[PDB]
Each structure stands twice: as structure tokens, then as C-alpha cells.
Design a protein around this nucleic acid. Sequence first.
RNA 1: UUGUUGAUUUUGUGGGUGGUGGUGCAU
Lengths: 255, 56, 120, 259
Amino acid sequence: KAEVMKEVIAKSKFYKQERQKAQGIMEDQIDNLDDNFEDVMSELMMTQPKKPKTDLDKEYDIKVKELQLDKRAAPSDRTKTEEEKNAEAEEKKRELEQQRLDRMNGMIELERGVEDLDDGFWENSISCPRTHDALLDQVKKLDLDDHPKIVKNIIKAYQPKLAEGNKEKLGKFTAVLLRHIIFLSNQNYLKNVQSFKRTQNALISILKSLSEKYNRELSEECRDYINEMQARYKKNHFDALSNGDLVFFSIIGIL
Amino acid sequence: KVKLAVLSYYKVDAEGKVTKLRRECSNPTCGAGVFLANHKDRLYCGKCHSVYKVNA
Amino acid sequence: VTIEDALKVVLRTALVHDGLARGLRESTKALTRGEALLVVLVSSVTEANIIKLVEGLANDPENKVPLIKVADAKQLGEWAGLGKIDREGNARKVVGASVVVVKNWGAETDELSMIMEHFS
Amino acid sequence: ALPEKVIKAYTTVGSILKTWTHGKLPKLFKVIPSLRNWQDVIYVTNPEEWSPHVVYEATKLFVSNLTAKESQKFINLILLERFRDNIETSEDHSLNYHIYRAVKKSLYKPSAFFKGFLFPLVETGCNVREATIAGSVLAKVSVPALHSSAALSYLLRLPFSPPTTVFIKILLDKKYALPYQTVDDCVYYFMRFRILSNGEDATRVLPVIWHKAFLTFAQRYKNDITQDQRDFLLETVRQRGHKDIGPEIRRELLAGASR
RNA sequence: UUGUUGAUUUUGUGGGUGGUGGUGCAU
């Protein structure tokens, strides 16, 4: 076995050396060829020769331009059966419910545990408004029932696909929308409670859609409100607390 | 990127006369309309990759 | 049949036989080679050079090529086929063409005779 | 004939190409596309003897430098024949990886690719194995919707052959925004196989690949056909429908809206 | 955008795909 192995190793080394030698000879041939490139090309240029398209070739070019003129179809995917859709929907529901139970029992998604956290805590045209005030100015002249109309138009005008960075603009708009929802509740609405109800819930539904894609941006704004109100409670106590706070907390339960 | 490089290749006088500021490739396949890139030591064709001396 | 309408079909036919040099670079390459049969130039080109240097090449004594004047680059690009058709059928994302040069007519149409008669 | 010194130099080029596997190609080889008589210069380099590595890099050199018209001959005369020869002469009837890559690069020029490989091959006794390997290159690589739609219209108008039906299925599988005229041509192709006066196509036995293509057409472009076109197709599956694939095509066709 | 070239690509957002995959079975 050992002798057979040594011959195999010797043969492999022997073939490797032959390949290297062949590689070396080739590079020398290329180098010699490059040196003689100018002489060969000079004569070839001297011997350069002096200066109807097929029916299949004529038809293609005719077809291409006609296709360019012609309108294009939108593509579609195969329709899943009702049983398959229900099975997929049931499967997704099972996965989400199982995740909720795990999160309840102490599973954290950075799948770390609550005990890990408790180490060392005790010892120590349409404009997209990047700010809450900007949204008001855009909707300053519009009625109370018209807030959902403008808000959805802003999202439509700045979808992610339309231009680069629209995700960020919508992400900031998610934070801006939440303050608008809380802001309206602070304003008096006993005069037109019905109209306020038609806008207050509608904006929340839009915020729910935004949160699905921009939960991170919403979460940052939500934490800021928690910090801000706490500071206001430090100085004003119950006077800081308003209806918008009570509204504000409910929305986290929703979202 | 170079913008409107084509404008730079040829010059127009007040009378409308057009003069070419660069040499054209002599390769038959390149033909007329193929301009050589002017380097400090050589004239280079971007189509044929041929190299010509500046003062040839 | 207006002259502009005559050119619209003629450029369409010239496309169908790959007979258009589209762009300033392709235009001037065609003119210098003597392959240009017709040149369509835009009025609103911001740089006065591009007008002069196309005009001089076309008015060369050795190869005189007829010249036409177009108001907007965007519509010329549409005739040059740059623009894209929509679900509605109207052109979209159309790219303006400052200069277009015809190399091959492709087919003999009555509209070509009108343009040539206009120049004669 | 080329100059004798040129012939000797390019004979040395060919010998290099036969065993060439890596590195820089000979400078003389790299300038062939610029030459007018490249076909004669290419002949002395023995294209049949080119190593698979050379075929890839030679393809990488030529379709980029040569014109669209000139590329088609390099495509048709060399890489097509090499593509067929390798499949026929291989023990397993497989294609070398480097030749496979070369077909991809030739697709970088769609018009020359369709006219140097696809249309010549299907019109020159293409076999199922050749269609499968070539379809995979077509399947994996991005092709323009414009060029493909014209290419699809071509294969639909040709006489029916299973190898051509593969390419028809591949293009349909790509899910391109086919122009409505192409959609009509797709319908007319599947129209011609129903029994009516009609050609022998009505009575021809239809393989599964024909039905799989018909399923792909139904799955994707159901919303882009007229009601009249839909009814005619529903009659085709009635007369020529497969045991298992037929009901699903009916299911897909019926759930679509008219344009 | 290619390597000079001409819309073949590049960018952002969505997004279907196991497939020059094997192995046996039934003319």
C-alpha cells in the first residue's frame, strides 16, 4: 500500500511538473509571438482585401419595430387553489401563533432569553412632511374629514419604487403620522365627533399599513413620546396627561 | 465620464468650415469616422487597438 | 400632409431598415463617411456649437446633405423610436434626440418624394 | 492567400490555442476581429481545434468587437458548430462548461444570437438534447422583452417540432411582457392544432411539452387575451386536451379577464 | 453602459424560480 501510494504521489508530482513545463513553453511562445506582432500585422494590413440581407433577416427587423410600437401585456402568476391558499394561510397562522407563545414564555428576538437581559441591570406636487408641523401646513386649509385623503396621497406619491430614498421618507412619515393622530385627539372635537371619528380611525388604519413596513421608524418615535411625556409628567404631573396620551397608548396595543 | 467629447473632436470657424482636430484610423475595417486617441507618445485606436506614432 | 407628418413616417420607415444614425456621435460619423442622405436637427439645442458643427458638416461642398429644422428634441427622439409605449399607448420615458441622420430610406414612399421635392 | 510570414505566425497561434487554458491570449489572436478577412485569418487558426477555454475567450473577444452583422457569422460558423459537435461527440451527450459560458456571452448580442444559434439550429434538425441545453442558457440569461417577443413569434410560425416547442416553452416561462401581437401569435399557434378544413397539425399527437407550454401561456397571459380568443383556446383543450394538464389549463383560462 | 460601443447594460424597490440533478418503475 505504501509503495503504491508513493508511486501515486510520484506520478502526481511527475504530471504536475509536466504541466508546469508545458505552461512555461507556452508563455515563451506567447512572448515570442508578441515580439513579432508588429511585423505580422504590417503585412496583413497590406494584404487587407478591398471593400443582400436574407428574408428571415428582413422579417426580424420588421417584427422588432412593430413590437416596439405595440403595447405590452402585464404578466400574471398561476392561481393557487382555495385549498392551497387556506393551507398556506393556516400554516402562516400556526407559525405566528407559535412565535407569540415563545415570546410570551421569555423568547427575545435580537433567540435570547429574559434571563440573559437580567445580567447587570440591578448592579447599575405632493410634499412629504418630514416633521409634524410640515404635515399641518399641507393640511392646514383642508377639513377634518380630509386628513385621510391627503395622508394616503402622500404615501402614493412617495412609494418605494417611484424613487430612491422614498422608503426613508415614508419611514419618517410613519413617525409624523403617529404624532398627527395623537395631535388631533388633543384638539377639541365635541362639535364634530362623527367627523373626527371618520378621520381618527382612518389615520390609524394608514398608520397600521405604515407600521407593517416601518415598524422600526414607528418604534423610535413611540419611545420618544414615552420619554417626552415622562418628562412632562415630571414637571406638570396630571396636567401633562391629556386625551392624546390615552389615545397614544391604545395605538401601541393596536400596532 | 466625458461630456460632449464629440464636440471637441472637430472645430468650426465663423464661416461654417469644419476642420478635424484628430487623425482618423487608417485600418480599412475601421474606415472613415474612427478617430485615434491622442496620447503623449502614440496615437491609439479604440476600435482596432492599433498603435501609431504621433509624428508618422 | 404636413412636412412634419411626412418626416414622422419617413423616420419610422428608416428605423425599420436600420437606416437611422441616432445621436450627435452617430450623426457626425455618418456625415463624415458620406453615408448621410438626410439630417434632422433640433432648434432648441442649448449649445450653439452643436447647431454650427452639424450645419457645417452637412453644407460641405463635397457632400451636400439636406437639412431640416425641428422645434423640440423630445419629439425628434420619439420619431427616432427612443420613446416607449404605455398601457394607454402614449409614449413614455422618451429620450430627446438633438440630431438624427438618415442613412437608408428602406422603402420608397410618397412622403419621401414630398420631402425631396420640398428641398429641390 | 495571406502572406506566408502571416500564415506561419498564425499557425503558431493555433498551436497555442489548442492547449491554451489560462493566461493572456496571443496578441495576434486578440486583433483578429479588427481585420476584414477575419474568416480567412480565423480559418488558419483551426477553430475546430480551439480549446474550450479559447472558445469562451474568443467569443468574449469577437461579439464585442465585430459588428452585429459580422458577429452572426462568427456565431453561426464557429460556436454553433462547436456547440453541436461537443454534444454529439461527448459520451453522455453533455456540453462543456466553457462552451456553455460562450453561448451565454453570445446572447449578450440578442439579434445575432437568435440568428446564429436559435433559428439556424431549430431549422437544421435540432434534437431534444440540443434544445434542452440551449434552452437552459436562454432560461438563465436575461433577454430583452423586445428581442425575445420577436424570437417567440418566429418559433410559433415555424412547423411544429418538439425541439422548437421547448424553446417556445422556455420563452413563455421567462414571463416577459409580451406585446399583444405576440400574444395573438401565441394564440394562433395553439389555434392551429384544433380539429375543424385544417392541416394535419389538427390530428398530430401532441407531447407533454406542448401542453406544458400551453399551461404556461394560460398561467401568465390569461388576462391579455380577448374573450373570442379565450373561447377558441377552450375549444382546443376540449379537442386536444391532455388527461391531467387539460383541466388546469381550463381552470387557468376560465379565471382570466378579457383585455 | 460595453470594449471605442450604442440602450445589449447601471441604479432603487418588489419578485418566480430547486434543475445540462440523479435514481428506479411501467412499450
